RNA sequence: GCCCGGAUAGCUCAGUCGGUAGAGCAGGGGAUUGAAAAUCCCCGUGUCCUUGGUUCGAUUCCGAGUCCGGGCACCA
RNA sequence: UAUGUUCGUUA
RNA sequence: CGCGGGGUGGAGCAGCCGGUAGCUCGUCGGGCUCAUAACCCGAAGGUCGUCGGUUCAAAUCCGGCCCCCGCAACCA
RNA sequence: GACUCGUUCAUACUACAGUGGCCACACCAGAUCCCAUCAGAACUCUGAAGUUAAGCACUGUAAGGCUUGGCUAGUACUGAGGUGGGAGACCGCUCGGGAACACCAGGUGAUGAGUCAU
RNA sequence: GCAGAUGUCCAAAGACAAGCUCAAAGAGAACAGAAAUCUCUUGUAGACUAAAAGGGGAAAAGCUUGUUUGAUUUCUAUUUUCAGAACAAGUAGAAAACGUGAAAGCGUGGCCUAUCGAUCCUUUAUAUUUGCAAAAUGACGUAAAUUACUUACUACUGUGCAUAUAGAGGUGUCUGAAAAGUUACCACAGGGAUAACUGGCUUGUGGCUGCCAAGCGCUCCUAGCGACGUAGCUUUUUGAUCCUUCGAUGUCGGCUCUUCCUAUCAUUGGGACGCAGAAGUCUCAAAGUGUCGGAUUGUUCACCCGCUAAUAGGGAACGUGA
RNA sequence: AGGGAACGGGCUUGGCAAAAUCAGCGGGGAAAGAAGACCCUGUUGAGCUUUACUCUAGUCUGGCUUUGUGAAACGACUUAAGAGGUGCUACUUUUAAAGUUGUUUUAC
RNA sequence: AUCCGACUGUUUAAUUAAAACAUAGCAUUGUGAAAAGCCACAACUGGUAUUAACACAAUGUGAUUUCUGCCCAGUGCUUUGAAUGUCAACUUGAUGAAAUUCAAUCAAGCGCAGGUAAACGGCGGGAGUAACUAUGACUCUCUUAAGGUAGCCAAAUGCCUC
RNA sequence: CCUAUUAGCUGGUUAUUUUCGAAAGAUCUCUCAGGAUCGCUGGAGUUGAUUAAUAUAAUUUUACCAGGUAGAGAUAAUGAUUAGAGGACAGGGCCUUGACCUAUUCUCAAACUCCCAAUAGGUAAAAAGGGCGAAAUAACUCAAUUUGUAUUUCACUCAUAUUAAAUAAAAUAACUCCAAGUGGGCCAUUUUUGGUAAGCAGAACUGGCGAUGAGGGAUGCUCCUAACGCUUGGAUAAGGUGCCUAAAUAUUCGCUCAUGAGAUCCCAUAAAAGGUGUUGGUUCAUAUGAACUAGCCCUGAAAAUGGAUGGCGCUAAAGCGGA
RNA sequence: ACGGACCAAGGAGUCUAGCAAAUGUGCAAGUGUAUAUGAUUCUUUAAACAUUUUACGCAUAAUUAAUGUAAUAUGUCUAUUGUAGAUUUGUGCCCCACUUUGCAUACAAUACCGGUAAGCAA
RNA sequence: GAUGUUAGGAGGGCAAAUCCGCCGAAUUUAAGCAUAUAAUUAAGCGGAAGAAAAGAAAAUAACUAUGAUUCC
RNA sequence: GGGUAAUUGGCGCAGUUGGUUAGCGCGCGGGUCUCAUAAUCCCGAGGUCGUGAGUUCGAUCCUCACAUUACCCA
């Protein structure tokens, strides 16, 4: 019967304990460029430019940048298909995403690694190692600390 | 008389029958309502580039075809 | 709702500036018998058959949207500015 | 046969969301009168129906019984 | 020629 | 039970259309009369059923209780 | 030893104490002028007689709070399986995930740019 | 389903800026008191922010003041509902013109979440945009030439009406007909998607049986009872439901007739007693046998009269209408 | 008996089960009749009623016509003069009975 | 003996024969006539009517006996009015270049003022109060158009109610 | 006769095989027995793929986010809520009553929260791209005619011989067109609202029934195994092996005696309360006495045609718990 | 739950109009020769055959209520620009990385036409 | 005018497919219904011919103009 | 929506440029008591705002305010 804009947002759109008050002045210095990823985290202290309830905690790509606002493309699931939605928010409600930060650091690290390896003409495997079964280990423990365990009775 | 008001039963499997279709993600997107005074200047940039290229092409074609 | 009689606001015609405007209230005005719809209705109502068009008889709401007529004092032209609906509307009442 | 209500003087009736028990009439003494009515002063009289519990304590709050009285009722 | 009721019982 | 209407002095009723509570009868005192009425003069008495809420302010407006009244409780 | 602009936004706060000032911060002297009020209190302006009393800085407290670690506890809860147990409420087992309050202990800051003084 | 709210209100309760800090408490001051005003201290908001509730807010979003009308015109990309249509309500912007501030900026109504409306018709505003079907209407206007049907050039051209665009007049059944009853005289298409009767699940309600023991029983919890509590059984009541029957399962009672259950009224044989006897009460095994005549009422039930040994309680489609 | 669309002739598990016949009978075949008449639904009706919506015969009333011939009275218009206030002029009152029109009565 | 209907009579052919209908009696209403009342008809014309108020038409009640109370606020019906508001066509006037647009008036109706209940109908509530108790002749008060009168009653009308 | 009127309603709707194969949601609707529209489905066609790889994925891993449900708490706040303990305003007779304050204490919340899971959710993991430079272009931006930005052109080069993590009968893809039926659902597990409850009413996830047979559960639309062309062998699942009935009167170890034993999830009811029946355990008492505990058994345990662990029956089990 | 005692024969998505999609066929910036005409054809023939070098429909151009206006634009017979991409060309008649060309199509950018705004307007 | 069984003549009725006048519904559709539609239809009344009716502009157009009616 | 009327003392009520005036009501004093009977002053934004006007509630004007008719196409 009731489906207003901020319906159901009693807890999501509430500032955390001892975290009230406007955003820090440093938030306005955050650099944003076209095509970089961004998280939509609604800041309830700023009422204008507030995103819809659904997009809180969603990641998207910047498709538009205005003087105080950002347009971001967000995937939304609508029954049998996904679709891009162009959500327009103010900069307080948006934050640079770390979703690909490991990818960027990996790109730089592998750049230098394979540069030096190709310099020394070695064929190196650069992909991530998805660690699985560990090798055998010949490990010695002082018998003064091998503790025997028995299941415990009831009290 | 009284009927079933609502259900989402079978809706998810109907959705997955033809898959959860993804957006196509085309390389270019229309700039229609986006950043005027930037995309207009980009139009001017591209016009300058095209004219500078095309006058070289016309010069080379004319001097190679007499 | 209290609205003053004058207002320094943008003129949309014949002066593209902010000018003084006289604010008044718009009124409907009588339906003239020569209007095409009225002539068609009267000709249709002639004859046998009784009432030929619906006559609304429900009347749910109790207020009307207030329409201000703005008259630029330089650009002699007028303009229409609709306000939210209200029960009590006065032009230039006591402050 | 369940659903409610009252049991308070000798008779009839009121009681701070428990603590004191009270008016009228019957009732003796009076005050008035020549006398008596009427009127006015004061006496007296009760487990606040009967049991049980709650409580620091119950007429009051419960629970039950007793008497008497106000509203119950199933189909076709 | 407006209104103006009543007076307990007995001796 | 579904409502829709109302609770104001001892009694019957206005204000109850937020800011100073009224009318009558009643009661009290004093006159008039041998006395009693009637009459005259002057006083008192309303915690506005209860509990919360909005307003600066609620008997008044807003909900919930407690009573009272008036309708509906039909087809089988 | 200090200051200005910041970052983190309590390890940074709060209470009560102690210590300290070359310039420096300040309190402080004054109200003609700009300005300001009921009030030169504040604000604004003009000063440099005084002073670390306060702000400020540092430290203390079996201090409160905050923060970190431990322990609570593989406890509570929970994803998957079960022709598991039990009258049911509930409760195991198999493959997995895993708290909180409380309590105990340590700590009470760190830092970017620029500048002054020596 | 639960607790509520909306059809409004606001020239400020909108815009901007500045200054200030609120509720409350404590201490103190003539009248002055629990409350009047003033002073200090503490004060994370315990105030206020139009309204419901939930979010947000402290050199503010609150209070005071000052200046204002951005509650303005036009247009995009879009979010909510969603069909990813419309309205509506928002978000981020662009082009004008402004307001405020010293400025950076902020302002396209209300701190955010609600406060609303198609086609057709009407109405009034705008227009150097148009029309009214062979034409003209400002105007022979401005320049030249004559006894004219002369010639060239002019954004600005009659009443009325119609159009384009923009608001407004409203559909609250709010994606939007102009609409009172009755049928016990009734009709049709259907419906067991749906009531009234049986049956089914359930058992609040009705009925029956337990457990504990505060009390009653002169004393004595349990001979017989058993309050406050609490565990069950039955389907003999009534509800609840709507599963089966609406191309029909004849819907009360009585009469008649049979059979069944036992939770036994009497009869048989026992146990207990608050059991002397007599009568009686509790209780066990037991369903073999029997459980009546009448007045009133359609009645079931009831209630009286009377006999009896006793006049028990129930089922069988509320047993039983070819 | 069970389960089943929750009352089976059929299904499952049991009991059982021996030709053909006659006459009765009303337990069952949720027996037969017959697209339930009760109830609900249908944007299907009909009878009836009214201060339902929209109309309509009748009826009442006015206008025009039919519709002619005379008279009178009243009203109004036009015209000339005076009076009231009043800036060659503008508005109201009265005075004629002068030319014109409407109404009411009346005669044939 | 009670109920109902006075009676004789009539009726739902094929589920109701009655307490229903009729009735005499009673009462009310319209109408003095071919320009009337009631009614038929598309028109023309007609029925009542070969009629004339002791008549015709329209209703209600339902023999006799004895009665038939109060209310005209409501709704109907009905009566008077140039004092009378409103209203249509038309007519007249003003304006306009004309269409038009504006004004003004002696219809009926409604409204106003009356009448009418054997028209439709309607016809109250709280307290207190008498020298045991009970009751309330009496009093106070709110209220209506009037407050259910004479009668009659658990009635074919009373739920509670056996 | 108009008229074969109209019907959102009932009934019927005619050969075979083969292949694909639903919906009972949703939005609007004088809409609730209907319709349109979306979804689900078929047919047609193109573009792709056909290169064990890219696109891709009801999956994970790595990295990074968002959350306030379960739990927890009541001294963190709010709202409840039971008790006392210590102490400087009110009242009465140095005392007492309270209030109030401080630290405690018992118990709570769908519309409470300091804290906070599990599960579920999102984004990213390189070639039409990335990194690094130069040179152009612009009316944008900046103090900048060479600040920045974007674009364009040239360079240089970033794993690929295993593929910028894993796995993948991943191209059985993507897209377009036309169109059917459907738009009464119901059930199970887990969660969950109303209700005393219901084979009741309403929702969430997934799987089913429907639309679907086969083996088992005696029987049974939904339970278990398992989904189906026609066969021959083999071996199993679920479940069983005394007979009905194919297979054990198997083996091995306990328990149980019932004058209403018990006997396969759903599943075809049983409780509080009891027992000096028997079998094991536990803790106190000088093999004795107690008090507990929990297995099986017994009481509690009454319904109507005659009756049902499915039947027979079974007790050195053919019952119960194992192996 | 309803219909069906039995058997035979009959018995139900068709016809026309109009629109679209699909596919086949002809022709193609055209296409269809409408009504009608002619012509040694006049059983069939009511069909076939034919059409003296602007009939009409649809298409070839859109847009606006409308007066109307109407698609790069003469530097060039050229045929807008990108990113992918079929095919083609070379060098390493048959695998492969760079070259060359760049269909269809997709995503965008540009011009230009009509309308509306805005600015100017003899 | 009236009257004539004066003389000579005509009309009447049937039949209807096409045709000419009149009169005139509702079902139906609108998913209801009232305007509208059905339909200037069915039914009803009258009147003709081998065809009938229409027809020689008080017509179009707006052109470089056409030229009775009917039909395709 | 159109036409008309109306709202001036607490009550009732007509009156328009050299203008607010009144009967009942309040109060007091008057007439053996009470009844009924003269009196002084108190009581008015002439409903509300504005406008024309030496000389106006006054003449017009809009606003809402009540009562009659009559009118209804989003």
UniProtKB/Swiss-Prot annotation, chain C:
Query: Record's Gene Ontology CC terms?
Result: cytosolic large ribosomal subunit
* Listed GO biological process terms: translation
Instruction: Name the source's superkingdom.
Output: Eukaryota
Q: Answer yes or no on keyword Nucleotide-binding.
A: no
Alphabetically sorted, this entry's keywords are: Cytoplasm, Ribonucleoprotein, Ribosomal protein
Q: Which GO terms describe its molecular function?
A: structural constituent of ribosome
Instruction: Enumerate the PROSITE patterns for this protein.
Output: RIBOSOMAL_L44E
The residue ranges crossing the membrane are none
**Principal subcellular localization:** cytoplasm
Q: State whether it acts alone or in a complex, and with which partners, per the record.
A: Component of the large ribosomal subunit. Mature ribosomes consist of a small (40S) and a large (60S) subunit. The 40S subunit contains about 32 different proteins and 1 molecule of RNA (18S). The 60S subunit contains about 42 different proteins and 3 molecules of RNA (28S, 5.8S and 5S).
Q: Which family does it belong to?
A: Belongs to the eukaryotic ribosomal protein eL42 family.
What is the protein's name according to its record?
Large ribosomal subunit protein eL42
């Amino acid at each position: 019967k009731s489906r207003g804009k901020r319906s159901g947002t009693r807890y999501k759109f509430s500032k955390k304990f001892r975290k009230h008050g406007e955003c820090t002045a440093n938030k306005y210095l955050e650099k944003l460029n076209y095509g970089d990823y961004v998280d939509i985290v609604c800041d309830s202290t700023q009422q204008k430019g507030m995103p819809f309830n659904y997009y809180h905690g969603k990641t998207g790509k910047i498709f538009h940048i205005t003087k105080r606002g950002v347009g971001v493309l967000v995937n939304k699931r609508v029954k049998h298909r996904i679709e891009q939605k162009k959500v327009c928010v103010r900069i307080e409600h948006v934050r640079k995403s770390r979703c690909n930060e490991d990818f960027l650091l990996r790109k730089i690290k592998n750049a230098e690694l394979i540069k030096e390896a190709k310099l020394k003409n070695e064929h190196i495997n650069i992909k991530r190692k998805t660690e699985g079964p560990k090798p055998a280990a010949m490990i010695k423990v002082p018998p003064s600390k091998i503790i025997t365990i028995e299941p415990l009775p009831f009290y | 008389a009284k009927s079933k008001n609502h259900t989402n039963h079978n809706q998810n499997r109907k959705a997955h029958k033809n898959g959860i279709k993804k957006p196509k993600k085309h390389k270019f997107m229309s700039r229609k309502g986006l950043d005027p005074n930037f995309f207009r200047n980009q139009k001017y940039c591209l016009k300058g580039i095209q004219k500078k290229k095309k006058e070289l092409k016309l010069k080379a074609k004319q001097e190679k075809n007499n | 709702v209290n609205v003053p009689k004058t207002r320094k606001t943008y003129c949309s015609n014949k002066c593209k500036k902010h000018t003084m405007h006289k604010v008044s209230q718009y009124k409907k005005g009588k339906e003239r018998l020569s209007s095409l719809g009225r002539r068609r209705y009267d000709m249709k109502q002639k004859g046998f058959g009784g009432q030929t068009k619906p006559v609304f008889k429900k009347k749910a709401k109790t207020t009307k949207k207030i329409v201000l007529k703005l008259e630029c004092t330089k650009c002699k032209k007028k303009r229409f500015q609709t306000m939210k609906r209200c029960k009590t509307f006065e032009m230039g009442a006591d402050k």
